[PDB]
Amino acid sequence: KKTIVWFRRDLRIEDNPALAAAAHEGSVFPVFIWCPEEEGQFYPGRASRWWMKQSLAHLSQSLKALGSDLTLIQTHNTISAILDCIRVTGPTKVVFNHLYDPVSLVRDHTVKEKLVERGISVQSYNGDLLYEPWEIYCKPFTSFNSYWKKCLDMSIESVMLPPPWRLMPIIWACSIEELGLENEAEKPSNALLTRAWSPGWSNADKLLNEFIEKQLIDYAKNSKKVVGNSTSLLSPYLHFGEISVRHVFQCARMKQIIWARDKNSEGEESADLFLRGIGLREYSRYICFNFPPWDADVDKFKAWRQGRTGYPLVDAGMRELWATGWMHNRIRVIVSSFGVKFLLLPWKWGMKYFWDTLLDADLECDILGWQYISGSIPDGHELDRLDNPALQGAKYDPEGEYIRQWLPELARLPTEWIHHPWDAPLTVLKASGVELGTNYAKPIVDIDTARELLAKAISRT
Amino acid sequence: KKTIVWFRRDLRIEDNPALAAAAHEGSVFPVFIWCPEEEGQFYPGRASRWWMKQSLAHLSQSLKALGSDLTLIQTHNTISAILDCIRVTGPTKVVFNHLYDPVSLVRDHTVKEKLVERGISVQSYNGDLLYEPWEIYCEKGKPFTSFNSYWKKCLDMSIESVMLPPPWRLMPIIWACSIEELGLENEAEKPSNALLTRAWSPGWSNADKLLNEFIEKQLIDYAKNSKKVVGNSTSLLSPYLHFGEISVRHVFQCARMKQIIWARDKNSEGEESADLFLRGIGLREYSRYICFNFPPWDADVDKFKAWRQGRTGYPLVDAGMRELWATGWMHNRIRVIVSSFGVKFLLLPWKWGMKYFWDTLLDADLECDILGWQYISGSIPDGHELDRLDNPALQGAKYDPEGEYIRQWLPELARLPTEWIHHPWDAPLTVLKASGVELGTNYAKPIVDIDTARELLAKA
Amino acid sequence: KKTIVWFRRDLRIEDNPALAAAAHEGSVFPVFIWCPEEEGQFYPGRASRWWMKQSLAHLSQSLKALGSDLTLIQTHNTISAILDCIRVTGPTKVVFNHLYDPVSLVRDHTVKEKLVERGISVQSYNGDLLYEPWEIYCEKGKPFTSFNSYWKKCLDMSIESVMLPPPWRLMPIIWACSIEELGLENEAEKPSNALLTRAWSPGWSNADKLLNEFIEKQLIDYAKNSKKVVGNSTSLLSPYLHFGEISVRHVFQCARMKQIIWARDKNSEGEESADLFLRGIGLREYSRYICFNFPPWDADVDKFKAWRQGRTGYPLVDAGMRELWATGWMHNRIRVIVSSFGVKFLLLPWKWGMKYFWDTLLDADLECDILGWQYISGSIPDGHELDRLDNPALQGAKYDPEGEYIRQWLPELARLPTEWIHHPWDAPLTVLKASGVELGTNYAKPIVDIDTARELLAKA
Amino acid sequence: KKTIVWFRRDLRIEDNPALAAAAHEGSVFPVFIWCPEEEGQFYPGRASRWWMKQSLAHLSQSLKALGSDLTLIQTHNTISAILDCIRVTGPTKVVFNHLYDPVSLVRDHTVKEKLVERGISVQSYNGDLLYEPWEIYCKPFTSFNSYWKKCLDMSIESVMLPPPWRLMPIIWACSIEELGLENEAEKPSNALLTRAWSPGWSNADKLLNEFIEKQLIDYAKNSKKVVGNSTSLLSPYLHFGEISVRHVFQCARMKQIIWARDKNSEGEESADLFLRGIGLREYSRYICFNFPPWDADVDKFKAWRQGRTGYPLVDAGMRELWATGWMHNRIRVIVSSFGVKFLLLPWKWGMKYFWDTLLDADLECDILGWQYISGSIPDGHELDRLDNPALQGAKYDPEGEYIRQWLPELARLPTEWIHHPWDAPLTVLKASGVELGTNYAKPIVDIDTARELLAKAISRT
Numbered sequence A, D: 001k002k003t004i005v006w007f008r009r010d011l012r013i014e015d016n017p018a019l020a021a022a023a024h025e026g027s028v029f030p031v032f033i034w035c036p037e038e039e040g041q042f043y044p045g046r047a048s049r050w051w052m053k054q055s056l057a058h059l060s061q062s063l064k065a066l067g068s069d070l071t072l073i074q075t076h077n078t079i080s081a082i083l084d085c086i087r088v089t090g091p092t093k094v095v096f097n098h099l100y101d102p103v104s105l106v107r108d109h110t111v112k113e114k115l116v117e118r119g120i121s122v123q124s125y126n127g128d129l130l131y132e133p134w135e136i137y138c139k140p141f142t143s144f145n146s147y148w149k150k151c152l153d154m155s156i157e158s159v160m161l162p163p164p165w166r167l168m169p170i171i172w173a174c175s176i177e178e179l180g181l182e183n184e185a186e187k188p189s190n191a192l193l194t195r196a197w198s199p200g201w202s203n204a205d206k207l208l209n210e211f212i213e214k215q216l217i218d219y220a221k222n223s224k225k226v227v228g229n230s231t232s233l234l235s236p237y238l239h240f241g242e243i244s245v246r247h248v249f250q251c252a253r254m255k256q257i258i259w260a261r262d263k264n265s266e267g268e269e270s271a272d273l274f275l276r277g278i279g280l281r282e283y284s285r286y287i288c289f290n291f292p293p294w295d296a297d298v299d300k301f302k303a304w305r306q307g308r309t310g311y312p313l314v315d316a317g318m319r320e321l322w323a324t325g326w327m328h329n330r331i332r333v334i335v336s337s338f339g340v341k342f343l344l345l346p347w348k349w350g351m352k353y354f355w356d357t358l359l360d361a362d363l364e365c366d367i368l369g370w371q372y373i374s375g376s377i378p379d380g381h382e383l384d385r386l387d388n389p390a391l392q393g394a395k396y397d398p399e400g401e402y403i404r405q406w407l408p409e410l411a412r413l414p415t416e417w418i419h420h421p422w423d424a425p426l427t428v429l430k431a432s433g434v435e436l437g438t439n440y441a442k443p444i445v446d447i448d449t450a451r452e453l454l455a456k457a458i459s460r461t
Numbered sequence B, C: 001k002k003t004i005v006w007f008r009r010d011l012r013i014e015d016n017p018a019l020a021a022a023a024h025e026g027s028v029f030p031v032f033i034w035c036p037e038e039e040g041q042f043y044p045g046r047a048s049r050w051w052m053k054q055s056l057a058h059l060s061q062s063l064k065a066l067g068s069d070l071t072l073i074q075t076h077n078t079i080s081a082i083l084d085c086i087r088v089t090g091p092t093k094v095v096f097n098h099l100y101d102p103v104s105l106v107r108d109h110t111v112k113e114k115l116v117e118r119g120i121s122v123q124s125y126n127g128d129l130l131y132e133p134w135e136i137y138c139e140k141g142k143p144f145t146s147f148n149s150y151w152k153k154c155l156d157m158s159i160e161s162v163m164l165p166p167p168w169r170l171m172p173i174i175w176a177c178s179i180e181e182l183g184l185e186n187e188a189e190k191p192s193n194a195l196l197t198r199a200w201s202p203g204w205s206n207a208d209k210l211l212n213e214f215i216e217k218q219l220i221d222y223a224k225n226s227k228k229v230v231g232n233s234t235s236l237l238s239p240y241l242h243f244g245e246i247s248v249r250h251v252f253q254c255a256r257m258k259q260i261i262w263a264r265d266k267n268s269e270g271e272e273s274a275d276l277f278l279r280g281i282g283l284r285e286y287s288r289y290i291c292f293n294f295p296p297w298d299a300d301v302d303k304f305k306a307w308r309q310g311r312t313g314y315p316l317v318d319a320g321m322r323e324l325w326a327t328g329w330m331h332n333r334i335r336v337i338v339s340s341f342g343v344k345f346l347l348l349p350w351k352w353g354m355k356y357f358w359d360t361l362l363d364a365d366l367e368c369d370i371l372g373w374q375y376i377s378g379s380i381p382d383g384h385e386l387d388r389l390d391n392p393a394l395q396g397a398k399y400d401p402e403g404e405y406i407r408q409w410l411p412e413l414a415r416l417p418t419e420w421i422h423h424p425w426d427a428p429l430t431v432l433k434a435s436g437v438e439l440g441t442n443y444a445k446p447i448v449d450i451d452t453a454r455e456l457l458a459k460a
């Protein structure tokens, strides 16, 4: 009874089906295998590698306390590494968990086949979803509303597993520092992110409990204001699998049941909104499984990414992104739509910059969001219409705090004109300290002309 | 697909296996059946019926919100009621959960047999234990005999149970009555019973809220507070566990996860606290296990009355009885102390003590009660033998080092020095005059001398 | 420039006029002189001597830090001690503060005369009042006779006093002894007296800390909490004011400033609270004023003993005496209730009640004591006349609406309904059985019937 | 018994000697007289007029509640206004308080003389000092240490007065809006300062009590760090006389006595430091009573005042000044010294800009501070030596928080190089996002060349 447990993106010990199976079966030999060449162009970015290294150290200590140890292998081939581990330890079984990336599907199939050839049994489980994409049908659905209605109607077919108690212990293995996860010049700069975040599954649990117990009830109200911290902040923890989506779902549903019993309408609204947000991730993976004339201007892109456009919401969004590796949903919508519909940029550049900076860069969610904003989905905002900054501000930033915190040189403009300065008269722009051109930039491209150019490209249709 | 779900002592909706099975299968018809005559002499007491009524109302509202409704039947026969429900609704299946009381075992077997006669399928699950009593044995296939070896084996093994999410919705579907005609409460004792709401608040929605707070903020100090009887030091989960409003597997998982983190980061106090709590949890398993596997007093009435009202003369006994009658609870050391006093000092028939505890304790549970009384009475080699009586001064110095527990429940002794507060018959009359205390006039002289009772027990 | 500062009842350093004068003048020699024989029958009681000793130690450390030192003399004559200090240090002046006790007036006059004979100058100031008793009179030059008119006039007038900062440093300069040979405390009663530190903590540094917190966070609710006897509702400043560790002018200014702000911003509740507090403050002035301007019992011993131990049968009386003996304090309504009970029910000689209050109360003050006893006894037209006795049910409904005060100090009555908790001899035996209460066996039947005592008082 | 109470800079009712005297004497007629022409060039600035208007409204409500009313007169002559009030109400006496400004001294003397001519008695008191400047002598002292030692040795000769209880009531009077305190274009911009401050004597008391009860004990430690809020923030309240300096002094001294009794060395240090700070104001008024080759470059001055010099501490100081009307003592030292010793500016411009922006512009304290930094006092730092930014930062801003809060575009520079960026190599300036010239300015003048030019002007001596 010797089993090899393969770790890829499930860096936790609670509700881990493959680990629970192997540990109940017999003796275990955990392993992590890192192979840059197989990833292709889905190679993770800097903000992701930093979080991955911290989580790997946390997990290694956790395993060593229990009684076994993590082993790290950097290689050029995965089959070779698995076969070498087999030849050295004399195992019988191999177990792992499912992923739905294209590369992941191909690699899993190849491993399964080339291992069953030599008379060694393999097994895979499901650890990252509520319903598998091949389990919900009408034909596949085509709209989120019908999809989510069906999913709510059905009943879940999964149980939760307790963590293993102890592990019975049992080549070119290396150490966490020779994996080459971080460059040499960028260690002191990357170290600053510890000011806001702290990776590890022991910290994911501590965050979720506090959110559920004290902040859910106000979600329906705070979930439209971009200042402070209003949402839950669980995306980087969910991307690496340090928390269980089934766990989150159960906690939210139990709160909703109590609130609905005692007639708390605000509670019901908040819980429903949160669960709809949770279900959008399922829908993203589902659609990815079931359905597999720009201006090449460089300085425009550079100004976009540094925050010198002239529009306050865009400027503050980019300013917070580069400094904390995060930004609100409305700001994601706003900045992405600006980048495509205003400066007419190739959307690949925007996707790639988000890939390298965002602390939670996830392929399916990224693609779904960009399709939504770009108007390739009938459910959304069509490419034709551009929104008005004054209305955006009045709706989401009613008092100017978000502006005045990240752009201090605009701390004494009245709340009436703080979002569209090119409107306010020179008398007010003198009474205030603001001075366009000298200590704040005049708008990089006029709104009307860009609207006309997009009208060309649209009325062509 | 029509199923009848039977509710007896599992008044919750999370981690309820029978309910989860029926709801996933099809349409459900929940029912609660109350039958005084079958209980015998294990009929529940007043403090238990009060809690049961409040929990039943809470559960009924909870079910009605989901989309079905609880139905309450008071009868003289259980088979008749089940058959009537069958005849009226046209079901196919019956499901329930396991209990390990003698009456429960007999009734479950009879129901299973007399129902399988008529071609209706039945099913029972396990909802109240970690390991079933028939699953743990020694190398020669023999049951264990000592708690230490038993718990070592249980720790070594691995658990064979999963947890189930609550059902989402229920598809709805005789002499049914209402929560007020069950006759759970007398007529004169409603205003007096109402006062207990000052301290407790029943319901599974409240059990969850209590457990989360205990685990998050008080576990780490359990190893220290768990020997002081004043304030609130322990967890206070026994009445919630007796009625099954919380899941023992849930409690076990939470404690174990905390222990893993503390052991990783080298927190010795954390490890000690977690181990103590889990040993406490395992003692309940052991109690049910032993119950499953192994099925010259002075008839003085006024002595018993003085015992139960709190006029013995010994401060710890007096404060224990005083808090018991007023809040329906008392600490483990106080349970040990009062029980041992009642048997070894006044030589009372132990049945009376068992029965008074049965009627007053808010969490009267048969197995735990029997296990505790055996331990204190010395019928178990692991314990304190009947021969030795303990010294009040040492008891006090060990558990009540500053006299707070005494001075709160016995205020007329609020200016006796901490040195003599536990054995007043020692302090000289000069100190008993400087203090306000006056034995015989506003506090009782000891009801029986310690030495003479020790001699009589030495005879026996 | 050598001055002798005399300390009697002004144990503070802020707003001390005599000390400020001497320190600004030159070199100082502080002194405290204790003389039991001159006091007579106004000798302070045990709870007062305890507080006095703690405050004296605090003050001595405070002075030694500044740069001089307190000197303590126990003697048989005061003139002899002052003359000896003069002969040893070669001073020029003597300064002190005013008191309005009879003994104080006589002693101050004698000292002034016998010192001015020998060519040494003396001086006295005013440190304990707002207006001196000889400064307020009516249009015909007559003293007032009712509190309402008196306080209206006092409010109308304007204050004629300033506040003085504490001295910065002191330039230093017989049978002197130590704080332990003054004989302030007996030998057997040190361990028992030590327990009061559980609730109180003497010293002027603590009086300031208490006043600031009260004013900043509790004044605004005074008008509401000031009629409920449970918990802590009032300010608790009386023992600090009796020893002069805080300045009544300071208290007055703080309250008035809060009232001005609240009245500006239209806060009716704030205005009511502030007015009530200041009326309370002014009652002390009135007490000293009247004392300055106007200089057939049953001799039953066991009745008195039962009264003082708390075995009468009436819950409010029992809880009041129970809290008095244990903390040295009680609420104003409880003072009214217990005093009126003692005179109008058991027909006791009022001297005994006055003396027991004198020995137990932590703030025994002559003028306030006399004023309160006159009010309750009906020798003042403003009050409640001796004829009428109040009803316990109405008293309870008015002041203790939920029974908490009863159930905390009398735990053996913790499960009587809130309807009958104040007059148990009314509730039927069915309720007295459903509850645990049992009159005669664990709680006393009323010591004297209310109706018969009312008839006897109706005779008188 | 009719008295006229004159209000100039004592906008409180507690410990007001003139008001207490008049109210105890008889019937009162309070008055405030505003006369722009007599002020000269000591005319108050915008941030001062805003605070003055709010405090005047607060005081007017306070008086009207008591039972009299404030009367506001804007005029061209003060003698004319006083004589008109006399002719209309038929008074007997006039009372006011002392000020030590040059204009104040002249005006008070003229009023006293021209009023005593007509047989009307006048009276003045002392309301703003501990010791009058003519009361301490050795000859006058010449150094702060000896002065303060003598002042500590002596004993105070002042008592405190309770507020009056009620007032017995009794021309071109106008309203708070026709005084013309605020311009028309700058009302919406000025309104923003309410975000941080709240004027009024009822608020000054509430602030002082909280400071004394909870923050004094840490003064000796927090009093060297420029980030957050460490000091007491009482200067604007003390400038307008809404709190009593004698009150502050008594509270601090009482705390010190208790701490010294119970052997708390840190407590003693904190209390002594605070009282030395208090005494520096006395010394400033004392010296003012007893002892009555720049580059004319405009764009350099503009860059200084907008915050585009290149030096992080200067930039953050000016950025916080324009937005909240305040700055720490070390920042005042740093910015003033920079302005004189680096860009060689005429010091009058710096004095005037501070005059218009600072919320607490006070003549004596301003002059004393500028003399100290400029080296005209032997007790100080001589003009010759310029300080090193790295050492300044290590001493006062050990972690870079003050920099990263007011200059967010520098939020990922390591704490080692955050104060002197022109030192860090281009590898680190690439790993960080910072880019000199494009989104942050290269130093406006080199440190070495300015040091050489100042060495010319100094070695001339």
Ligand SMILES: Cc1cc2nc3c(=O)[nH]c(=O)nc-3n(C[C@H](O)[C@H](O)[C@H](O)COP(=O)(O)OP(=O)(O)OC[C@H]3O[C@@H](n4cnc5c(N)ncnc54)[C@H](O)[C@@H]3O)c2cc1C
Pocket (backbone or CB within 6 Å): A231, A232, A233, A234, A235, A238, A277, A278, A280, A281, A284, A327, A328, A329, A332, A333, A336, A358, A360, A361, A362, A363, A365, A366, A368, A369, A370, A373
């Ligand atoms: C252009 C664009 C790009 C995006 N890129 C990403 C990305 O790389 N990674 C990513 O995880 N999300 C992405 N999103 C989705 C969304 O912006 C974030 O998931 C959201 O900010 C999560 O933050 P939160 O947990 O604090 O918010 P919460 O409101 O607390 O969200 C709770 C959880 O619900 C899920 N969720 C909520 N809304 C969405 C949504 N619209 N789409 C998918 N899942 C959702 C997430 O898992 C999230 O953790 C993108 C959206 C847009 C418009």
Ligand SMILES: Cc1cc2nc3c(=O)[nH]c(=O)nc-3n(C[C@H](O)[C@H](O)[C@H](O)COP(=O)(O)OP(=O)(O)OC[C@H]3O[C@@H](n4cnc5c(N)ncnc54)[C@H](O)[C@@H]3O)c2cc1C
Pocket (backbone or CB within 6 Å): B234, B235, B236, B237, B238, B241, B280, B281, B283, B284, B287, B330, B331, B332, B335, B336, B339, B361, B363, B364, B365, B366, B368, B369, B371, B372, B373, B376
């Ligand atoms: C004479 C006597 C009578 C008892 N009668 C009862 C009874 O009727 N009902 C009852 O539930 N317990 C009984 N006990 C056990 C024990 O006194 C209580 O279980 C304990 O007070 C539970 O309170 P707690 O949850 O606050 O303490 P905790 O220390 O928090 O206990 C945690 C849990 O562990 C279990 N547990 C801990 N110690 C024991 C133990 N010695 N035996 C069994 N289970 C234990 C209980 O389920 C308890 O809820 C009795 C003990 C004695 C000596």
Ligand SMILES: Cc1cc2nc3c(=O)[nH]c(=O)nc-3n(C[C@H](O)[C@H](O)[C@H](O)COP(=O)(O)OP(=O)(O)OC[C@H]3O[C@@H](n4cnc5c(N)ncnc54)[C@H](O)[C@@H]3O)c2cc1C
Pocket (backbone or CB within 6 Å): C234, C235, C236, C237, C238, C241, C280, C281, C283, C284, C287, C330, C331, C332, C335, C336, C339, C361, C363, C364, C365, C366, C368, C369, C371, C372, C373, C376
């Ligand atoms: C029978 C009887 C005896 C009393 N004996 C004393 C005594 O020995 N010493 C004593 O100080 N008070 C005495 N009082 C007055 C009153 O009971 C207490 O002053 C009051 O409890 C003070 O407590 P407090 O400061 O918490 O209440 P608060 O309401 O906060 O009182 C504030 C202050 O006002 C003064 N005050 C308020 N009410 C009265 C009053 N009726 N008479 C005089 N002063 C008042 C006290 O100085 C008190 O400190 C007696 C009253 C009665 C009826």
Ligand SMILES: Nc1ncnc2c1ncn2[C@@H]1O[C@H](COP(=O)(O)O)[C@@H](O)[C@H]1O
Pocket (backbone or CB within 6 Å): A144, A329, A333, A368, A369, A372, A377, A379, A380
């Ligand atoms: N059909 C969809 N596809 C992708 N994203 C969506 C979709 N619907 C809503 N969202 C996201 O969820 C947010 C909800 O906004 P609203 O539709 O106003 O409730 C949107 O702003 C998007 O960020």
Ligand SMILES: Nc1ncnc2c1ncn2[C@@H]1O[C@H](COP(=O)(O)O)[C@@H](O)[C@H]1O
Pocket (backbone or CB within 6 Å): B147, B332, B336, B371, B372, B375, B380, B382, B383
């Ligand atoms: N073998 C046992 N049987 C029954 N109860 C026990 C047993 N061991 C311990 N207990 C209970 O657990 C407590 C633990 O006490 P100690 O043995 O001192 O740790 C005892 O005081 C009993 O209440």
